[PDB]
Design a protein around this ligand. Structure first.
Ligand SMILES: [Mg+2]
Length: 225
């Protein structure tokens, strides 16, 4: 597609999130770059409002699947880049087992030559000392797959996947993800066959950073065709 041409090099990324979880208001700003040729993302996120009131790993999936590496033989299945530069809306319900849920709405689009992800996040029905508001999740993030299917009536895609957040005691907090994406623009997009994205993510800290923050390195590769 026309859009995939925008991703042949390194692309600067901006992420901006506004959040309310159980009435705890917070904002996150991220900066970095994506190189879809290698499925590679490098980003640093900062909580600009103070302490983040939820664990950082629980925001990883919310905080740009257009940077996935689609192998040449599957390029006709890359919805995400096909919607660019006008972009797409990405909506999710993330259901934390035995706890609350996030509902998210994001717009992913180019602003000049920069890929922007703008997100509103609302979290409700969280337990005051559950694994999320009680900060009982380890600072890491497991490898996993994101299963994509076409949504022809919405000219878009859906995804379903199960994130497993490691709890500090050796157990797991499941976060069921249901996702829908729809184009913003009126140009044609690629509606894919069933496939998945395979992810790997490394979380770290900037030793010189005193603000609450997350350094993220992620690799994502499309597969399943
Ligand atoms: Mg462990």
């Amino acid at each position: 597609s026309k859009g995939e041409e925008l991703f042949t090099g390194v692309v600067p990324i901006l992420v901006e999130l506004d959040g309310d979880v159980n009435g705890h208001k917070f904002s996150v700003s991220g900066e970095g770059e994506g190189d879809a040729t290698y499925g590679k993302l490098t980003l640093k996120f900062i909580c600009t409002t103070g302490k983040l009131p939820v664990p950082w790993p629980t925001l990883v999936t919310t905080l740009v699947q257009c940077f996935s590496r689609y192998p040449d033989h599957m390029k006709q299945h890359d919805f995400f880049k096909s919607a660019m530069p006008e972009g797409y809306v990405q909506e999710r319900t993330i259901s934390f087992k035995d706890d609350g849920n996030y509902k998210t709405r994001a717009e992913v689009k180019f602003e000049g030559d920069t890929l922007v992800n703008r997100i509103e996040l609302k979290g409700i029905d969280f337990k005051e000392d559950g694994n999320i508001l009680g900060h009982k999740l380890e600072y890491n993030f497991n490898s996993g797959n994101v299963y994509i299917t076409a949504d022809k009536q919405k000219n878009g895609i859906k995804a379903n996947f199960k994130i497993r957040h490691n709890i500090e005691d050796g157990s797991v907090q499941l976060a069921d993800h249901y996702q829908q994406n729809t184009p913003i623009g009126d140009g044609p997009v690629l509606l894919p066959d069933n496939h998945y994205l395979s992810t790997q993510s490394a979380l770290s800290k900037d030793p010189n950073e005193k603000r609450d923050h997350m350094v993220l390195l992620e690799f994502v590769t499309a597969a399943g065709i």
